[PDB]
UniProtKB/Swiss-Prot annotation:
Reactions catalysed according to its record: L-seryl-[protein] + ATP = O-phospho-L-seryl-[protein] + ADP + H(+); L-threonyl-[protein] + ATP = O-phospho-L-threonyl-[protein] + ADP + H(+)
Gene giving rise to this polypeptide: PRKACA
Naturally occurring in which organism (per UniProt): Cricetulus griseus (Chinese hamster)
Residues that coordinate or bind ATP: 39-47, 62, 111-117, 158-161
Free-text description of this protein's post-translational modifications in UniProt: Autophosphorylated. Phosphorylation is enhanced by vitamin K(2). Phosphorylated on threonine and serine residues. Phosphorylation on Thr-187 is required for full activity. Phosphorylated at Tyr-320 by activated receptor tyrosine kinases EGFR and PDGFR; this increases catalytic efficiency.
Predominant location category: cytoplasm
Lineage, broadest ranks: Eukaryota, Metazoa, Chordata, Craniata, Vertebrata
Modified residues (Phosphotyrosine): Y320
Alphabetized UniProt keyword annotations: ATP-binding, cAMP, Cell membrane, Cytoplasm, Kinase, Lipoprotein, Membrane, Mitochondrion, Myristate, Nucleotide-binding, Nucleus, Phosphoprotein, Serine/threonine-protein kinase, Transferase
Name of this protein: cAMP-dependent protein kinase catalytic subunit alpha
Gene3D superfamilies xref list: Phosphorylase Kinase, domain 1, Transferase(Phosphotransferase) domain 1
Length: 340
């Protein structure tokens, strides 16, 4: 790599480590915000649009029920999520603005990205052209270069986690499975269609699982469906471990070649995990037209700008039953979440 890239990554790691070793805590409280709308809901958490009462700024507030986090064995993962988010800084990562906890819940207050999930847009139009897929893919390549340099594995790449901003660029959200890992790690996590073979086979695995997931994402953007699709998890897993893939005839030869090298079952032969690291991806013929500096600087005109009316518009997200944010009179799970 050029000295300029080496010096940029060295500064990025220094700045990350300073916040990683001394994390911020307790930087807001719940009654500083008005609740507007639920934007999504899961097994132990929800995300809600909120407005700060004094400044009028909008934010996306992720709320985790401490008792449910414990029951679903996510304690370490939720502590990882907040400690990583308060320490990172990159153009294609959603920014954490505040965090706090109370007797019942954990709270992460993010910037709100009003354009919606990539997934919605992809499903509405069917598939993206190769230039359109390549613009988003280039942003993920740079983001993974940054995260991997800091010894972070992301472990949750999928179209639902890629939000489209007011300039039509990507911001990656949901660090619930992200982890600082210097060698190998072992937890079964991720979404079925995006899992690498070594995760499915219960091996010790490393950052190469993110590069496999990038191959699944590029395939899905350019085709409209993921490569290993099937009706039940066990059948998806059989396809993933098999070492074969079928490509639509509309794919270019360069796209097919790049995907065979990212979707390589043998992790020791997979692009992103060879001696030249990310440069085997950046220098591939499919990326020959990509100006990497111009993408990082946000100087390239985006394929499209999402339609929305302003920073409070929720029209690009869907509708959920609205439930209370109740806070108990007794502290739950205080020892488990001391460091949050
Ligand atoms: C992983 O993401 C990166 C973004 C950017 C750089 C970078 N590499 O060289 C320069 C330069 O200043 O010439 C830069 C930025 C624009 O400062 C490197 C990596
Ligand atoms: C940053 O702005 C956001 C908007 C929406 C969400 C969201 N709402 O429900 C599920 C999510 C993401 C995919 O985890 C998160 C952040
Ligand atoms: C240049 O090629 C494009 C492909 C796709 C889109 C697109 N992706 O999602 C939507 C949506 O309506 O959600 C659209 C447009 C605005 O209709 C835009 C441009």
């Amino acid at each position: 790599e050029q000295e300029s890239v080496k010096e940029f990554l060295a500064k990025a790691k220094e700045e990350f480590l300073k916040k990683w070793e001394s994390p911020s805590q307790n930087t807001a409280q719940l009654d500083h915000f008005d609740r507007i709308k639920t934007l999504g809901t899961g097994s132990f958490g929800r995300v809600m649009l909120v407005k700060h009462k004094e400044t009028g700024n909008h934010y996306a507030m992720k709320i985790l029920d401490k008792q449910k986090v414990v029951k679903l064995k996510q304690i370490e993962h939720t502590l990882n999520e907040k400690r990583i988010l308060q320490a990172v800084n990159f153009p294609f990562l959603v920014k954490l603005e505040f965090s706090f906890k109370d007797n019942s819940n954990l709270y992460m207050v993010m910037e709100y990205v009003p354009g919606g999930e990539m997934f919605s847009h992809l499903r509405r139009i069917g598939r993206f052209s190769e230039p359109h897929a390549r613009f988003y893919a280039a942003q993920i390549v740079l983001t993974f270069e940054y995260l991997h340099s800091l010894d972070l594995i992301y472990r949750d790449l999928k179209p639902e986690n890629l939000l489209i901003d007011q300039q039509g660029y990507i911001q990656v959200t949901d660090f619930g499975f992200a982890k600082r890992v210097k060698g190998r790690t072992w937890t079964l996590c991720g979404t079925p269609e995006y899992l690498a073979p070594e995760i499915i086979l219960s091996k010790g695995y490393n950052k190469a699982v993110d590069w496999w997931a990038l191959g699944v994402l590029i395939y899905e953007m350019a085709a409209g469906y993921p490569p290993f699709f099937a009706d039940q998890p066990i059948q998806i897993y059989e396809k993933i471990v098999s070492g074969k893939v079928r490509f639509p005839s509309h794919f270019s030869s360069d796209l097919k070649d790049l995907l065979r090298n990212l979707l390589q079952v043998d992790l020791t032969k997979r692009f992103g995990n060879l001696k030249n690291g990310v440069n085997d991806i950046k220098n591939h013929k499919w990326f020959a037209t990509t100006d990497w500096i111009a993408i990082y600087q946000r100087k390239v005109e985006a394929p499209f700008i999402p339609k929305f009316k302003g920073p409070g518009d929720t029209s690009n997200f869907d509708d959920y039953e609205e439930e209370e944010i109740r806070v108990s009179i007794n502290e739950k799970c205080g020892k488990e979440f001391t460091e949050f």
